[PDB]
Design a binder for this molecule. Sequence first.
Ligand SMILES: Nc1ncnc2c1ncn2[C@@H]1O[C@H](COP(=O)(O)O)[C@@H](O)[C@H]1O
Ligand SMILES: O=C(O)Cc1c[nH]c2ccccc12
Length: 573
Amino acid sequence: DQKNKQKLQLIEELTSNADQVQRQVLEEILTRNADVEYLRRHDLNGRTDRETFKNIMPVITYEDIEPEINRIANGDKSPILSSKPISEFLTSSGTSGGERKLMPTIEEELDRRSLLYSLLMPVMSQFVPGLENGKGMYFLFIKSESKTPGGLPARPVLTSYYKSSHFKERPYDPYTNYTSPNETILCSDSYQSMYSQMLCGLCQHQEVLRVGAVFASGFIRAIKFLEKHWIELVRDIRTGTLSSLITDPSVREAVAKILKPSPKLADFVEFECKKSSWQGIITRLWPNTKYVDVIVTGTMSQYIPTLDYYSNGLPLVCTMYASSECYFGVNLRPLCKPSEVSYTLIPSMAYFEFLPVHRQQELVDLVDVKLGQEYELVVTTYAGLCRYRVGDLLRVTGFKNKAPQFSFICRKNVVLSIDSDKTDEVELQNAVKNAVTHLVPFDASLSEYTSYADTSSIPGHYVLFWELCLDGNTPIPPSVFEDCCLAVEESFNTVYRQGRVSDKSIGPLEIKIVEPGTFDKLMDYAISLGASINQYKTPRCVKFAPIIELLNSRVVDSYFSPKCPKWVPGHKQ
Ligand SMILES: Nc1ncnc2c1ncn2[C@@H]1O[C@H](COP(=O)(O)O)[C@@H](O)[C@H]1O
Ligand SMILES: O=C(O)Cc1c[nH]c2ccccc12
């Protein structure tokens, strides 16, 4: 019987009693945090009931509780948001004033993250058999850490999770037996982390029954890493000796238990990697792979054709929906189509509310959301976030017993995204305005521009299309356009700049100069589909393949900066 059946029954119990669980969660939070400064400031006066909470407590954004956050981050240890000690800040990919948002968490929250993860394979065991008889090849990575002036860790939620006893000291689980040893995941050197993970995956290739990464982008980068380094990898496999470039002793102690001299495997890997076409290479190097486990909902959907290419059309699986401030839900139907993914929110994670979005107690509870209606996700967490707006838009597609299921629509205001980076229109506009100052000495200027997330390169990069207006009589040298590139990048927020400098999840920004009349063609094309002259601006971003092919066909010159933007871990202040 055991675990799977119990976990599946737990899902039944939680979703059949969703409203009661939601109530018990809110009651527990307000009872614990009854005396914290934030609740007392709003005069909640020790009350714990739903009606009081919804009538009294305001619906907030990050900027609303930043003074509380800063105070805690500066070392104020009084109960301001939470009665249990804030153990760390989980730095979100979402920003504020260019800097990562600091999400308070408490130690207890790891239990709830682990509960969520423990649901995944029992759910999957209903759709794909035999996964306990083999391994999963996942490429998992830690990121830069930082510390608040008061001494609290500030780091991404997965970096926090991987380094915790819940992952680093976890027991052997046959349904989640990874090819990557903990030492290779927890390696601070990102090159060594990637190389050793790729090697271990190759060494255990016949046992691999599934592959992936947290994000589509992450898995694509691992494939590209093999494209560049397979010769070194084949040499390691052939001789049974790990590359001396791997200097980390914990790494390589771990590899040494896995790596054995095997010219037969080396010949096999060489054979496949030598081939000019890498179409379907996943199903050749790892022939027992049943699916690809990566997020391809949200902006990550742009990577579907790339994964399909390398996998020869294996099923793409989206298992979960979660964030820094709170873990949310699970896909109860993982082998569905990527366009039909819905996430069932787990009612014991947090108190969930929903702000209706239309094309006086305003909020609607989890069980009262309406089929087909769009909402903004609003959360009340154990660490003291009260009715915080996530910025995620969701649509109800159905119900699991009493618990609703949501397709993910978007994170609000995201224009450009390659990996976890999110660039909005204001950021983009500001960035382009800082870069055009470089065209002033040449008495040139920008007439019009647009952008796209270029996925043809690994890692992806931002592309800007620039149509200039030249009034002077001196050509602009490549060095100045390269200055323009860098200037754009320097104006982007810290997550973008971290992706460029530290995580290598983003390639150099490219500016493509297009010939005169190019954006005229765009408009003409934009009217043949969708034809509103009155309401027409050249869009800040484009995404439709024929439009992009049109713009690329009219490129006169392109430029990247050889330089990287500034980046320093932690908040500016
Ligand atoms: N499965 C998913 N599909 C689409 N977007 C997601 C998914 N999981 C997380 N996200 C987005 O990433 C955010 C979490 O980012 P972070 O706070 O940095 O972990 C969420 O609030 C969503 O906007
Ligand atoms: O930065 C990280 O690695 C944590 C993270 C960022 N976006 C996420 C979405 C799903 C679960 C974890 C994360």
